[PDB]
Amino acid sequence: HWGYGKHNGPEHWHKDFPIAKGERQSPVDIDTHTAKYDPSLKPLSVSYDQATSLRILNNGHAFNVEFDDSQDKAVLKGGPLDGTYRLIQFHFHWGSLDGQGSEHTVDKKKYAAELHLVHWNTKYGDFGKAVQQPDGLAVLGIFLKVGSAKPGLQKVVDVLDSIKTKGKSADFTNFDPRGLLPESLDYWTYPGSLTTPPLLECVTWIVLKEPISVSSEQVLKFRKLNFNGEGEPEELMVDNWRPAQPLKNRQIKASFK
Numbered sequence: 001h002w003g004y005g006k007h008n009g010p011e012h013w014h015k016d017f018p019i020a021k022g023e024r025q026s027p028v029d030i031d032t033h034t035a036k037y038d039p040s041l042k043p044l045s046v047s048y049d050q051a052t053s054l055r056i057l058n059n060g061h062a063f064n065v066e067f068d069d070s071q072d073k074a075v076l077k078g079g080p081l082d083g084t085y086r087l088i089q090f091h092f093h094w095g096s097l098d099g100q101g102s103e104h105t106v107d108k109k110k111y112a113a114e115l116h117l118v119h120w121n122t123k124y125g126d127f128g129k130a131v132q133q134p135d136g137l138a139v140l141g142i143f144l145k146v147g148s149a150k151p152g153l154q155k156v157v158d159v160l161d162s163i164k165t166k167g168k169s170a171d172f173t174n175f176d177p178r179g180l181l182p183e184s185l186d187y188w189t190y191p192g193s194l195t196t197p198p199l200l201e202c203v204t205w206i207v208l209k210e211p212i213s214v215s216s217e218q219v220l221k222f223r224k225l226n227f228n229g230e231g232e233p234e235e236l237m238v239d240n241w242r243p244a245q246p247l248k249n250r251q252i253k254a255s256f257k
């Protein structure tokens with residue numbers, strides 16, 4: 001099954017998931033001179049005051065920090081969205097070196113990593129239903145560049161040594177995802193997909209223009225994770241990103257001028 005290596009990576013996914021070559025795939029390159037400022041877009045509403053993190057899991061592709069999504073405790077609303085989307089998990093995509101790692105690009109620039117806060121539309125009742133719908137998910141994408149440390153990232157990076165290999169999880173309560181946000185909520189938005197199999201076309205992408213800064217030491221610790229299971233030959237978890245996909249018949253809108 002699928003992964004990020006030469007033999008099972010993005011160029012192979014279409015064989016088991018033919019939607020890989022569909023009309024609304026992600027990620028995409030954001031051409032900042034083609035995206036149109038849309039003065040009808042609202043400010044995002046990111047309501048994470050009551051967020052309840054539970055657990056962190058190495059799933060063999062990335063690590064997910066999971067939230068209690070059994071009530072409306074951490075929600076994304078506003079922006080291009082209608083209705084209420086509950087945070088279920090966040091995760092990252094990152095590179096073997098700082099010059100690559102992000103899935104979205106900005107005028108072809110790749111950032112060192114990209115954070116995805118994944119939310120599902122409550123009008124569909126559960127995540128498995130939501131991913132069957134064109135407006136089922138909203139993913140908030142945040143670029144990471146390497147410079148100064150991100151203080152609110154450090155609790156994530158210090159637990160990584162305890163979930164080194166596929167299938168390992170650890171308690172991860174009381175984490176505040178508001179410490180992963182940049183200062184500005186200006187964003188681009190377009191209709192797309194999950195960037196991992198099954199690649200379903202159910203996502204409203206909201207990608208923030210302002211990257212967060214993380215330290216070289218912080219991203220080095222991401223790169224010490226493993227794709228493999230315990231006791232298996234070591235395969236460092238690096239380069240777990242899908243490259244940019246054709247934009248096709250889609251328009252990327254900017255919330256800012």
Ligand SMILES: NS(=O)(=O)c1ncc[nH]1
Pocket residue numbers: 116118139193194195196
């Ligand atoms: N990478 S992504 O945010 O499209 C995603 N979320 C859950 C599975 N894949």
Ligand SMILES: [Zn+2]
Pocket residue numbers: 091092093116195
């Ligand atoms: Zn992702």
